[PDB]
Every structure is written in C-alpha cells, then in structure tokens.
Paper text:
Isocitrate lyases (ICLs; isoforms 1 and 2) catalyze the reversible conversion of isocitrate to glyoxylate and succinate in the glyoxylate cycle, which is used to bypass the two decarboxylation steps of the tricarboxylic acid (TCA) cycle. The [name]-initiated glyoxylate cycle is essential for various organisms, including bacteria, fungi, and plants, to reactivate the TCA cycle in circumstances that limit carbon supply as an energy source by offering alternative energy sources such as fatty acids. Owing to the crucial function of ICLs for the survival of [name] in the host, they have been considered major therapeutic targets for the treatment of tuberculosis. Although it has been shown that itaconate produced by a host directly inhibits an [name] from [name] (tbICL) to protect against the infection, the molecular mechanism of [name] inhibition by itaconate remains elusive.
Among the crystals prepared using various combinations of substrates and itaconate, the structure of tbICL in complex with succinate and itaconate was determined at 2.58 Å resolution. The crystal belongs to space group P6522, with two molecules (subunits A and B) present in the asymmetric unit. In our structure, succinate (a substrate/product of tbICL) and itaconate (an inhibitor of tbICL) were bound to the active sites of chains A and B, respectively. Thus, although each subunit contains a different molecule in the active site, this distribution of heterogeneous molecules in the two subunits did not cause significant structural differences. In the active site of subunit A, two carboxylic acid groups of succinate are coordinated to adjacent water molecules, by which interactions with residues such as Ser91, Trp93, Asp108, Asp153, Glu182, Arg228, Glu285, Asn313, and Thr347 are mediated. However, itaconate directly interacts electrostatically with proximal residues, such as Arg228 and Asn313, whereas succinate does so only with Arg228. In addition, while succinate directly binds to five water molecules, itaconate directly interacts with only three water molecules. These differences suggest that itaconate is relatively less dependent on water molecules for binding to the active site than succinate is. However, we found that the positions of the L5 loop (residues 189–197) and the C-terminal tail are different, depending on the conformer. Moreover, our structure corresponds to the same open form as that observed in the native form, although subunit B has the inhibitor itaconate in the active site. Based on these results, we assume that the incorporation of heterogeneous compounds into their respective active sites induces subtle movements of nearby residues, thereby generating abnormal electric fields and finally obstructing active site closure.
Residue numbers in the entry:
A (entry chain B), D (entry chain B): 2 to 418
B (entry chain A), C (entry chain A): 2 to 192, 195 to 418
Write the structure that this text describes.
Amino acid sequence: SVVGTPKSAEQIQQEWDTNPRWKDVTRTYSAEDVVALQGSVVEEHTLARRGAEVLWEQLHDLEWVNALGALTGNMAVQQVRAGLKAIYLSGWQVAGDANLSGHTYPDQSLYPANSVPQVVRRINNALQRADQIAKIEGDTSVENWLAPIVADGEAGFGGALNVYELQKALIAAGVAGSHWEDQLASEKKCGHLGGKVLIPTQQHIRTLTSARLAADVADVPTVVIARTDAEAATLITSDVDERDQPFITGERTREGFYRTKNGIEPCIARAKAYAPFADLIWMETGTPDLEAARQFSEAVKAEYPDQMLAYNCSPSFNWKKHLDDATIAKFQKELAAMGFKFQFITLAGFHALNYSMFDLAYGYAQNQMSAYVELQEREFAAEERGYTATKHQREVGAGYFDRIATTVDPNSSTTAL
Amino acid sequence: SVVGTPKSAEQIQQEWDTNPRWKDVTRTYSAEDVVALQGSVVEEHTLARRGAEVLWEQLHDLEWVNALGALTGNMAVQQVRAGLKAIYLSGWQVAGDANLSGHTYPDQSLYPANSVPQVVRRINNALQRADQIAKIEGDTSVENWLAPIVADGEAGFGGALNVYELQKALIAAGVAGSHWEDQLASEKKCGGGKVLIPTQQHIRTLTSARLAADVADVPTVVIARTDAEAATLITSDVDERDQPFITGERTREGFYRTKNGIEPCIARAKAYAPFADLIWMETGTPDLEAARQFSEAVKAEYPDQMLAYNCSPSFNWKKHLDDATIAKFQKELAAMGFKFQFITLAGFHALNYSMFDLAYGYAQNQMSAYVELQEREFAAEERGYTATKHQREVGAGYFDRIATTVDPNSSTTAL
Amino acid sequence: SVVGTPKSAEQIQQEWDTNPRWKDVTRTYSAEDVVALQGSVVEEHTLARRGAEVLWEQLHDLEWVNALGALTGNMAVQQVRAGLKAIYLSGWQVAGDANLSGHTYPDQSLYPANSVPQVVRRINNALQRADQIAKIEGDTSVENWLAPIVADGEAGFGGALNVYELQKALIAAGVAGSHWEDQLASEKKCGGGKVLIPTQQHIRTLTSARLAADVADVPTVVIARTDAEAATLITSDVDERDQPFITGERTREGFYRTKNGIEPCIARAKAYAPFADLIWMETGTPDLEAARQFSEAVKAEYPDQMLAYNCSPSFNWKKHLDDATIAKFQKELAAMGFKFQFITLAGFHALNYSMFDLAYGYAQNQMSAYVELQEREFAAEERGYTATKHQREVGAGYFDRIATTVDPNSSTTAL
Amino acid sequence: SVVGTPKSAEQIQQEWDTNPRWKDVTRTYSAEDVVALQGSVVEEHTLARRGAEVLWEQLHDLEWVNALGALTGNMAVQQVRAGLKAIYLSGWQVAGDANLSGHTYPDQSLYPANSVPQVVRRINNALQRADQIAKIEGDTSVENWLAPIVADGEAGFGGALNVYELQKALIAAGVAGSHWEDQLASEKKCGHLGGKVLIPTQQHIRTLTSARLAADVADVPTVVIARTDAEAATLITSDVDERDQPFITGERTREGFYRTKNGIEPCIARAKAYAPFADLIWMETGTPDLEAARQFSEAVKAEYPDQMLAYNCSPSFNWKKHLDDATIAKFQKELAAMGFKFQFITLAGFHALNYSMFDLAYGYAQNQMSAYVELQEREFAAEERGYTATKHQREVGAGYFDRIATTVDPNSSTTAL
Ligand SMILES: C=C(CC(=O)O)C(=O)O
Ligand SMILES: C=C(CC(=O)O)C(=O)O
Ligand SMILES: [Mg+2]
Ligand SMILES: [Mg+2]
Ligand SMILES: [Mg+2]
Ligand SMILES: [Mg+2]
C-alpha cells in the first residue's frame, strides 16, 4: 500500500513559495526539517484541513467572522443553526465546566492539557450529526454545518514540546485555528503588587514557531493566532530579551519576576514582533474601547498593513453602564473596518447556560410546571427563526439511527433521498 | 491499620432487621453473601451515603421532591442555588450531549456504560466547589449544596453483571439514587415499538442493583421503571405473569406481541414493589386520571409504596391544559403518592434554547444581543443569581486563598 | 473547500462490481443507502485504510499471517521490531488489564464499549512513534512499522446500532480488521454454558459491521466467529437453520437447549461466509482433525473462503504434543486455509510472568534479580532489541530534534 | 444527615501536636487555614488513608521497603503476589506506555497531568480484585493485597495550584505517598551546554507545602517525598533565593537561565532545606555508588539524624560492567543501613514488558508455537513459587463474577465461606 505517502521537501517548499496562504509567513525551519519529522506515513486530518481552508476563505471574503464560546456539542450546533460561520472554544469555559479533571477551575491552566482537543472533537462530532440529519431530511437551510473551530491553546501547558503536542492534538480533533498567549498563567501573582506574568518575546516566538511546525508536520494549513497579555501584565519572567528591556523597570520581586511597564506600547511592540509568525494578532483588553482598538490597529498596520487582527469582546465589561446603545450596536462593524476580522465573545456559553438554568430552576422551585411551560413557549416561538430542538428525538439523531437500522434489516426498505 | 474493616454478617443482618429504611425491602440473598463479596477492605463512599440518606429523609419530610435534568456541573450548581433539593441525571441528555464516546446519540443505550457515572462525579465536584466558595465567603443562603443525585441507569447495558457494575460505578461517583427499566432498547424494532423483558428478568435487575449497593455498604435509593404502557413486544413468554397479555403472535426476530397499557404496568409494578424504593410508570402524555389509577392500584397492595413521575418535556402542556391545571399538576400527583418528580430534558432545552436565542440575536445585531442577556443576568442577581461574577463563580477566590495559604509572606483572612 | 467530498453511488457501485476485493462479498443494502448516511463530508481514515489494504495483501501473499495479543503500545512495538506483520488486539486482555472502567474483568463484555478502540488508537500511536524514531535514525531494519491491527469486537455490546458504533470507532482509531461473534456473553448461564443468538441475528451483526466500514469508506477486514462448538443454549428457535439442533427443552430464562459441536459450527460458518472475509470457529482444545473437518466442510461450498484460528493459550501444549507437532501446528493449519492465526493471551502471559519472575527474584535478592533481566536485555540486542536504550525507545531523540528545529540558534542534522 | 462532618481546628491542631506522625513536620499554615478550605463535607478517602498508614508503619518496622515500577494493574498484582510490600508508580513509565494522551513520550512532563492518578486508581482496582478473589477462595497466602502506592508527582505540571490539584487527585485515587522534584522538566536544555533546570529552593518548599496542604485538606496522612535534581542540573531559573547563591556562577544563558555548580554539595544543602517539609528525601543520582550514598546520608543526618531517605536504583546503569556480584547483592542492605528506607527501581515494568514481549515475539516469528510453549513452561514452573496467572479466567475474577451471578439468581445457592 501507498496510502498516506509523505510529500517531498521540494513539494512542500514549492507550496510555501507559491501558495498565497503563506505570503508573509516566516518559517525559521526548513522543508527538510518538516519531512524529517513525518515518519513513513502521514495521517490525513480531513476536518482540520477543511476547517482551516474554510476559515481562511471566510476571513478574506466576509466583512468579518464573529463567534461565541461553545462548551458542548449542542451549543455549537445551535450557533450554526442560528447563522454563525465559526465556533469559538474558550479554554476558560472548559476550565469552568468541561474539562477532563471533572473539576470546576478558574482560568489558570489547571485542567488536563488534552481537554480542549476533546471538546474540539466533540463539537465536530455534533456538527457531523447535524449534517447527517440534514442530508437525510433534505434540509438545505444551512450551507456548511462544519463551521471552522478556533480553539484556546492557553500558553501550551509548559514549554515548546507541550505547545507542539497540544497543537498536534487540536489538529487531530479537527481544529481550524488555535490561539497562543505570552503569559505564564500558573504563576499569576494574586497579591496587591501581583498580576499576570509575561514571558520574553523570544519565548513566545518559540511558541508560535512550535505551533506552526506542528501544523506543517501534520500537513494542514492551520490558522495561528498570537495573543499578547502586555496591556495589563505587571511582571515578566526575565529581562533577557532586549525587545522587552525598554519596559523593564529594574525591580525584581521576591519570587524573581521582573516588574515591567504595561499598556498599549508593549502590546504594539509585541504584536510587531509576532506578526511574521502569526496569521492573526490579538491584544487582550479589559475595556472595550474603539479608540484604543484603532490605535493598536494603526500602529500594527503601519509596519504590516495586511496583518489581520482578532478581538475578544469582553463578557464581564458592564456594556450598558459605559456605552450607549448605538455604540454597542455598531461596535463589531467599526472593529471590522479597522482590521479585526475575527471577533468573539469568550464566555457566551457559560453565561447562556448558567442564566437559563438559574431562571428555569428558580421558576420551577416556586411554581413547578408553569416555569417549564414558559421556556417551552419560547422554544415554540423560536421555531419561526429556524429552531428545531423542540423536536428532541430527531435533533439527537433518532431518524438517522432508525435509517441505519432499516438499512441493516433486509426485510425493511429505505426511503430514496 | 484497621481502616475500612468490613462489618460482620450479623451487624448487616441486624441493620436489615431493625432499621426502618429496610421495612418493605426484600433481599433474596443473604448477609453472608454480601460479606463474601467485600474482600478485606470496604471503601467508604461519603457522597453516595450522604446523598442517599438526605434523599430518603426528604422523601419522607417534604410534600414531594422535584428535580430538573442536569448534564453539566454548572447546571446542577444553578439548580441548587435556585432552591432545588435534588438533581436528576438524564441518560437521554447524556446520550445527546454528554457521553464518553464524544458522539450525539438518540435514546437507545448507545453510549459507553460508564458515561453517566462520570457525569455524577462531575456534578458532585461542581457542587463541592460551590460549597467551598460559599464557606470562604460566609454565604449561608443555601443550606445544602450537596443535593442528592438520582441517575438514569437505563436497563444496565447488558445482564445482571452489567447492572451490578453500573450501580457500583454510580455509587463510587457519589450517586444517591438510580432508576432501572424493564426494556431492551438495543432491540427497539423500528418498522415496531419497545421490547419488554420478562418480569423475572427485571426483578433480577433490581436485585443486582440492591446487591451492588449492599456490597458498597450504602443505602442507595432504587427506582424501578416499567415501559409496559407503550411497549408492544416482549422477548419471551416464559414468565407466567407476562402470559396474560401475550397475544400468541411472534415477529421475525422471535419477539412476542403483548397488549400494552396501564394494566400490565400495574401488574409489573406490583411484581417490582418488594425490590424497589420507588416505582415509576413511564408515560408519554401527562394524564392525571391514568396516574391516579396506577397510583391507587399499586397502593391497594402496598399502601406505603412511593411512586416517581416524569413530567413530559415534549407534551405541548399548554395547548391542552389551562394555567391552573399546569400550576397544580405536581401537587396533585404528590397527593397521589408521586414523591419524586422531575423533567428529564430540562437541561437539554435550556441549553439548546438559550444558545440558539443568543446566537441568532448575535448573528443579526452582534453585541446588542449579548447585552440583552447580560442585563437579564444583572436583573436575576436580585433573586440570588451569582454567575455574573464569573471568576468567583468558578473558584478564583478559592484558589487565591489556596495560593495565600501556601505563601508564607501573605496572611489568610480569618473566617 | 472540496476536502472530503463523498463519492457518488455510481463510483461505489462500480468499485463493488469490479474490485477483486469485493468478490464473494454480499451486501444486502444499496450504494445509495451508503451515500445517504455520509452527510456532506467524509473524513479520511488513513491508518484504517492502509492497515486494511496491507492486511488483505498479506493474507493473499504470505503462507499465513500470525499475531500475538497486545494490550499496550510498547507490546505492539516489540512484536513488530521482532518481525511480526500483524497485531492482535484481545478484548479478553482489555477486560483483564486495559479497559476504560479501570477494573479487572473476566471475559463477559463488562467493560465500556469504547475501550478496544482506545487501545487500537494507542497501539497505532506507539507504532507511529517507532516509525518516526527509525526515520530520524536511518534505521531500515523494519520495513513496515504500521503493522495491520485485528481487533476483538465481542458481539458488539448490544444490537445492530451498538455493532455499528463499535465498528465506526475501531475504524476511527485505525483498525485494519475486526472480529464479531454470535453469542450473548452477558447471559452466560453459570449453573449453563454460552448462549448463542439466532443465525440471522449474527448475519445482522456482520451486515452492520460491513455497513459501518462502507459508510467510513474503508475496506476493513471482517471476521465472523461462531461459538457453536461449546454453547449449549440459544435465545430463540425462530431461525430454521438453528432448529435442527434444538432439543425442545427450555430453561427457566426461556433459553432453548441446542446440540453443540462441529456440526452447527459448519452450518453457521456456511451461513456467515457471504458476509465475512474470514471465518473463525472458536475452539477450546487445539485439534488438527477438527480444524481439518471444519476447513474442508466450509471450503466444499466456498473453496476460496479464508479461515482464522486462535491457538489456545491455556492448552497444556506440550503435555499432549511432541515438539515436532507443536513446531508444525501453524503450518499445517495454514495448508488447510487458516490464513490468520494468533495467540489471544500472549501479552497477558508475557506481562504477568515477567513481572512475577522479576518481582520474586527482587523480593529475595534485590538488585541481583534486576541484573539478571538487564543482562538478558543486553544479550537480546544481538537479535535487534533496542529498549535497553530506554530514552531513545520512548522518543527522547525525536523530541530533541523537535526542540532543535524550533530553536533558531541550533541546526538540525540532515538525513 | 451528618455523614462526613469536618473536624474542628482544635482537633486537627491537637493531632498535629500529639500524633508522633507529625513529629518534625513543619506546616507554615494553620489548622484554621485547613478547615477554611474544606467546605461543609469532607469525603473519606479510605485507600489513601490506609495506604499512608501502612506505608508509615512499614517504613518504621521493616529493615527497608523496596519496590518496582508498575504501569498496569496486573503488574502490581504480580509484585504483591511475589512478596513485595509497596508499589512504585513511575511517571517515566506512564509517559512511555500508560498515559491519557495515548502517545509514547519521553520523560519531560508531556502527558496530561491526571495520568498518574488514573494509574493509581487502576492499580488499587486491580489489587482490590485480587483481594476479593483471595477471600472467596480462602487464599491466606498474602497478608495485605492493598500494598501502599508511591506515585511520581514530577514537579506538579505548573505552579502551586497545579501541585495542589495533582496531590488531591492522587489522594482521591488512593495513593499512599507521592514524590516531588525541584526541576522544570519542560525547559530541559538539550544542547551541548544544556541540561536540567533547577527552580529556586524557596519554590520547591512552596511545592512541598502545597502537597502537604492538599493532604491536610483531604484529611489523610499522605507520605511526602522531596527529590532534588541538583547532582546533575547545570541551570536554575533564578538566583533570587540566597540559599542557591553559593552555587551561582554569574553566567546567564541566552534563554535567561542561570548557570549553577552541580554535584553533591547543592544536593546536601537542598536536602537540609527540604527536610522540615518532607517525610523522605531523595537525591536523584546517575551512578549507584555506596560511598556517595553514605556521604549524602551522613551530611543530611548530621542536622536531621531521624530524617528518612529514599533511593532509586538506576535501571540504565550498567550494573555488571561496574560492580562485582557481591556489591550488587548487598547494595540495598547497605543503603538501608545508611537510612535509605524506601528503595525502588523506576523502570522495572518497562524493561520486563518490553523484553518479555520482544523475546516471545522473536521466537514466535521464527518458530510459531514453540516459542509460546517455552513461555508457558516457565509459567508452569513458576507455579511452585506461588504464581497463579496460569489459571487465567480465575486470575481476572471469573469466579468472583460467577459468585455475583449466583448470588443474584434466587434459584442458585452460594457456597459458604
Ligand atoms: C474571559 C476571557 C477568557 C480568556 O482568557 O481566554 C477573556 O476575556 O479573554
Ligand atoms: C529513570 C528514572 C525515572 C524518573 O525520573 O523518575 C530515574 O532513574 O529516576
Ligand atoms: Mg483561557
Ligand atoms: Mg434513557
Ligand atoms: Mg473477548
Ligand atoms: Mg518522571
């Protein structure tokens, strides 16, 4: 058998040289380095490849791509049924309510490192079932059930090899893109002079290089997002990288961390340093602020006018205390005009799930079935916008499995499609 | 070490004889049979014991115990924060969106048999974190975070040993009660209907589940479910109790056609009563008259037998009922002896609907839709909702306190 | 994007019609039935396809394909390093020491149904790491590290849909072949014997497994196993092919007593042949005459039908056979058409014995026992053993090369 | 219900004050700090408590406790049947052939952090089945099937909270003791001036404190082992701790690591610093050397004469090239005389499994059944020393489950025990 024969270094190099996908993508390693790590057989990763291709297309065709955080398969199925074209997989949400430890965790890289890959695979499985059901029912209402997944890679749960293995695991599960941040969450100092701890610029370039190499060895054009936490971070592990030295204050704490001046300047500097190694750049920010977004946007594009940006819209910001309805209403459109082509709400699923269950359960504790009928009536109404989960058996594939059982029975006949 | 030394057959026997918990509980096996299966060390199962005890207490003190299906830890945390005293763990919901295969399945015992135990363990982990947070914050608003969990056991994923291992795994995870049904879902004929198993086989199932609870040394609550209302087929006519409803026709698989309805459900419920702490007649449409007839027929032989009731999540409740009937439904049922009531698919509907509504709003208006949800969350704070404070909701202050305890240059707040 | 576009019903049909792989393969369903179950995108399964292709090739080129049971990744790596061309994945061994419950189980389909797929995936991961290491080291001593895997499918853990999902999960993990048996282990009567299912039900199982392979678009090798040599009971007399052996007596569970032996195994094998790439008569004692009689009876109707043979790990081989018979056993069987042969429990015995012998030596003499094992490992290097270089065996040089690739101040060795 | 009611701070403090177990055990946190983290209900951890108690007993009664690395449940069952009184759970072996990623990994904290806890739970399950079988068969030949498990905790997969969560997960699975090392494996530099990277002394005291606190909050007297990697390590993350400064050379690498003088001196210094926080101390060493063992032994006991030590006997050292048979034969007895009360071979299971399968498979590839009969004959012979796995069905519990099935059947009767 010749199934899965690797490409040659020449073919790979030629694709890096000629495919517009790799315009302005720096790989400090060689095509031979990639082939040297592939063994004799390269597994195809169908969903990871299709998702990365679809995601790149969409980022260049649509006015922007927006997404909500999904932590279960059904959540993602509903996001797609409602008309979204991408799925965001929050590591925060996974820590909170969907990781392999079984525990509720805060957002400090506490959960087992293969947790997000498992949820990626779950989400793709759920979308695949929605697509199977759609096909056997002649449902053409959704063009692409297999929406690309953008997954939270945290800072990789360790060093370069941890980064590599996480990216490989995300790719195997069918991820379309992954984001990677330049902090050490496990040493977040929670005292009064504490805060987030950055790692040196060169180390995050190491992380982004590792992630790209895992994609190359897996032979898929995964979308790579660099996140910088330098807006708020007050500490950094080391001053060894001279690009970081302009912000070093000269103080070192009792734990050995270096105090560093934070804000938009180091975020601009780090984004420029990361741009050659990142398909998109993301400045984590506490306050939604169109002006600060524009300033970061323009500083980065002054050196890299084609560099695409990513934007998280803060779920904890008190939006309506601080912005009027019109600013809220135009926020994403403005950001998209500035180059933020991927935008998302990290904790959408957490809030929807916790709120809907609290509201239903509170009603239920006081009035039993009357609360449930309020929810059921809203579901019935929602049928008008395309909601289908009111037909619960069919939603989870009962018709699909009946068809399988009928296919297998030689005395029952299947309906022609 | 003496940790975990088993009891004697004598102590076990005396507890079966004198503890009011075991009035009306038949064990066809012996206390020696139990001790023989325990080895040299018996692991303590704190959460399974405490949950089963609280569940029994509540079933005898409150007017009724009700619950909503939970498929995530946060879901159960919110149900308890909102004032519920029990959690229902739907295997249907687990098939749909929370099982170890990673796949979306319909309700036919397709998922790996240890999936529900994992979700039990997750739910307990989440309630324990809520309890930890409440303690360090002086929050007394909820008196018992560790609400008892009642879990779906399907028909055990096989034979008596499969039942035994599932009950053992549910107990290990900290389950308080488990329900067990008398159908073979993996042979549901689809041309058809559900296929029952003989009455004696389900008595075997209930005996297996009680034996696993005994060997684990916890007073787990056992719920027997009968699917005889709707089931049209049965695997065999070997049981004389099943023969009155056998028509005599056999399908191409060898299954026997059987008259379904409330009559075989009353018969099977009476057969199951000695082996079940609660009895549940699965029904498709909510029907107070059918519930009353089943209740009364069963209590005519076992006036103390407690019953359980699923309130249909798919029934178009209102299309068919006025607001007052809907509002009194559970109270009427409770008066009939239905002391555990639940909505199996509450979580599935809350999750799917809330995400569809948010996502549709978002696709059309971006941040304005999220702001609608956020404002509703703010409003809900007035009723005790706390998840707007998201970091604290998932334990950020708790883990900060651990970090402060471990740091010798920081001092911990005294409680 | 066009990635993963399904084939047409027409292409599938033509491949079933013209590819020699599907000579003598009956599909009672249609190509349209297959396309209807594929959705819009078909995931490629590289390892399942390559393994199934290599396995079919080898079964037609070599005198016979033999294998040992592997329950860990390293076990399979050593089997291939030693020169074997296939891996056997024992579900018995998985029950005993490698299943997702964490428990030690006997051989009664007690473990979670996705456990064997996980071990398939693990074994492939381990072979892939060995292949990676060999490449960066210029090691050509092994031509194919990715030996095809044949996995135990039990009886599917339920009905047709359970079979379907198990085959799908085995393919997803990269399995090359899977075997499926016609008993209900979860009802093994223990007073007793194995309980068969009707012939038509196992044809349903094999059809389910072929359908799952088709929908996944891989030419998985399907092995049908019959337990009719020893089984004394059967669930139903509904199948006319089973009736000649029914005695007419029924047990208290409703099972029918049936004459066991080679005769019902020949009958069932002939019934299964159109739906099976290989046929396997489970047998307790190795018996060349019984193997010859079964082989010849089956090939009288299907002269091209390939057979599979488990060589008993519990038989006291030698107490009963001279050295020359033992030495020729597999070659004789191969001459009879047994083209896949294996020892189910090779790994269980190698693991348990090597650890008992080492640990006993250690308990009595501490380091001297370990030094005995280490010296034997050194000696084995002469035959190609490499695990004495332990860091390199588990990938230390490979991950060093990744670290060197990622570091822009270090240069990588050219291959 | 009152099941699982927590103890008061007073009871806890009184046990720390009066129980000889806690003689010379420093806790820098308070009993109130412990109670503050326990919520309203404390789960009992039966096997973790019994294993920690049995392990402490054995460490004080026997001349020493020795162990072999086990990576499957059957391996541990065989170690106990052969007469060992403890089980060692190698994280190396778990990386190599038994972790939740499914992948073969080298020993660099690459696998998901809950992997060892899963194997602990597996090993206890396997021993529990052996004990059940023994009881129903009247097998009294083994006194304690539930041998204590000592598990590899690596350096905790991150910071203090990662350490805490791993220790809690090990305790929940029934671990008896856990060991913790002072290196950052994920930044091991593999170049020519590379090597292992130490963390500051104060940080490892933080790790050991965290591990003790997780045990206290879980209410079990888990055995805590500190390992130092300073014999060979050439780098350290920071020079901020003045106890480390004597060995700092003054050079810092391009990655920001500090070059540090290695050997037995920093191992003695670190062991002394760790002793108040560790039930046993372990100097990782490359060469088995009774003299170096004695020197480390005596330096530590000069300040802490009662401090127990732990010793790994190197599986890669070429024992018979470098030591005569008599030294090999007396090695553990000598070490025990010097205070090494827990001794183990980390990779015993890896070598036994890989070698036995290679030997069998090589024989099999050339001669089919003749190779298997050689193995079977050795098993038959081994029956004489108590080996039972030749009876394969009974070994994995077939008799136990037949008894369960017979217990459940009201028309079959059980055998009286
Ligand atoms: C809440 C989050 C989650 C995260 O850190 O990924 C944010 O606002 O970015
Ligand atoms: C091989 C090992 C494994 C380990 O690092 O724990 C050693 O010798 O210590
Ligand atoms: Mg995160
Ligand atoms: Mg169900
Ligand atoms: Mg088997
Ligand atoms: Mg290790």
